[PDB]
């Protein structure tokens, strides 16, 4: 189960820079675009966690 | 982590590589054991929270020493009031109860 | 953007003659004077973009740090090509990535 | 005598400072010089290495355990445990 | 692999001692009249001819 988990939340960090290469990102208000990204794959995988 | 080399955390991973793998993500538990690049970045997040812990004991003990000497003398005197040594009245009241 | 003297190797700036009414190149290094055929005297745009690609190389090929992709060559039709992200460094740049074959020695994005 | 020298001046062996590392690509381990084609759970899981089709390494590690220094070098398991405990 | 990331002294001297890997070497020094040399066999131009 815990491997199962962890390959889906890296599954989701590649879709998310999938996304995030093809300009088709959400931006969060007042804050770029890569920082926007780095918090979005922080989340992810300390949800994982 | 950091690209502390040209845009690549480590030699031994690509350049522009921003898989979890290659910026800090330890899949591994301390049971299992850590790889190496697993190993580095957790000895640099150690290293990191020391420095931290060591800066921030001395800068809290500059504010409580500065603090302590700043309310040195305040005492409650016998009619209820709370004054300094100068005599002058900090509070009518303490704690205003 | 602007020229240098033709004998002075000096900086040429802009100035009027009001006998003609009109706009030429002078340099006080000298007492040359040339006809500028461009009113234009100033450029800023807030607005930068330039500087995505950068300094490309031919010999970008043999670098074997970059990540090697299969993307297919737009007119060669090779399936082997590096990729790398925008090399200018502005706070707000895109990740958008671009492509180079390993074949015909040429850039190409992701479009 | 054939000996680390030898090695070196043979050209298999070479040293490469800070500033070089920055040119060159390097595996762990010889196995993963070798791409290959499991499942078990008592082993701990390796990087996927899945950015690029293909990977062209320059150099290999001779051993990952000698980036410790000597101090280090006594810590029996030093990758089971925290650290700061290190 | 240069120096030793898990041990540092605690204290002040945190991250200013450190101690070579244990297979680190420093350099002893070379002359440079050699690779001048085979720089300038090897069809290197020199900067006065540089355009
Ligand atoms: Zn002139
Ligand atoms: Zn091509």
Not at chain 2, 3 to 10: K, P, T, W, Y
Not at chain 2, 41 to 60: C, N, S, Y
Not at chain 2, 62 to 87: C, F, P, W
Request: aromatic content about 8%; glycine content about 6%.
């Amino acid at each position: 189960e815990i491997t199962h988990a962890i390959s889906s939340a890296k599954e989701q960090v590649q879709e998310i820079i999938y996304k995030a290469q093809h300009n088709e990102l959400e931006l969060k208000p007042g804050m770029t675009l890569r920082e926007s990204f780095e918090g979005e794959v922080s989340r992810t995988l300390n949800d994982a966690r | 982590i950091a690209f502390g080399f040209a845009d690549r955390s480590l030699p031994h991973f690509t350049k522009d590589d921003f898989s979890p793998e290659s910026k800090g993500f330890v899949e591994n538990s301390y049971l299992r054991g850590l790889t190496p690049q697993e190993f580095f970045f957790h000895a640099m997040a150690g290293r990191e929270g020391l420095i931290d812990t060591a800066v921030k004991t001395a800068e809290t003990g500059y504010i409580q020493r500065r603090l302590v000497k700043a309310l040195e003398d305040i005492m409650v005197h016998y009619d209820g009031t709370t004054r300094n040594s100068l005599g002058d009245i900090i509070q009518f009241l303490y704690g205003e109860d | 953007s602007f020229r240098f003297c033709l004998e002075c190797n000096n900086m040429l700036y802009p100035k009027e003659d009001k006998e003609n009414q009109r706009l030429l190149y002078s340099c006080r290094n000298c007492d040359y004077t040339e006809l500028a055929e461009d009113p234009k005297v100033y450029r800023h745009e807030l607005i930068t973009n330039i500087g995505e690609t950068a300094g490309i190389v031919d010999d970008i090929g043999q670098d074997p740090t970059l990540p090697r992709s299969d993307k297919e060559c737009p007119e060669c039709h090779s399936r082997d090509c590096v990729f790398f992200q925008s090399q200018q460094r502005r706070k707000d740049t895109n990740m958008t990535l671009f492509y180079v074959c390993l074949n015909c020695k040429k850039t190409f994005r992701d479009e | 005598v054939y000996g680390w020298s030898s090695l070196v001046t043979s050209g298999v062996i070479e040293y490469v400072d800070g500033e070089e590392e920055e040119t060159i690509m390097i595996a762990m381990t010889p196995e993963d010089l070798q791409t290959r084609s499991l499942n078990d759970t008592a082993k701990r899981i390796k990087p996927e290495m899945s950015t690029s089709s293909h990977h062209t390494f320059t150099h290999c590690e001779i051993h990952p355990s000698m980036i410790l220094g000597v101090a280090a070098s006594i810590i029996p398991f030093p990758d089971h445990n925290q650290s700061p405990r290190n | 692999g240069l120096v030793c990331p898990a041990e540092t002294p605690e204290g002040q001297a945190c991250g200013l001692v450190k101690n070579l890997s244990l297979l680190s070497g420093i350099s002893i020094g070379s002359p440079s009249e050699p690779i001048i040399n085979f720089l300038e066999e090897w069809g290197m131009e020199p900067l006065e001819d540089y355009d």
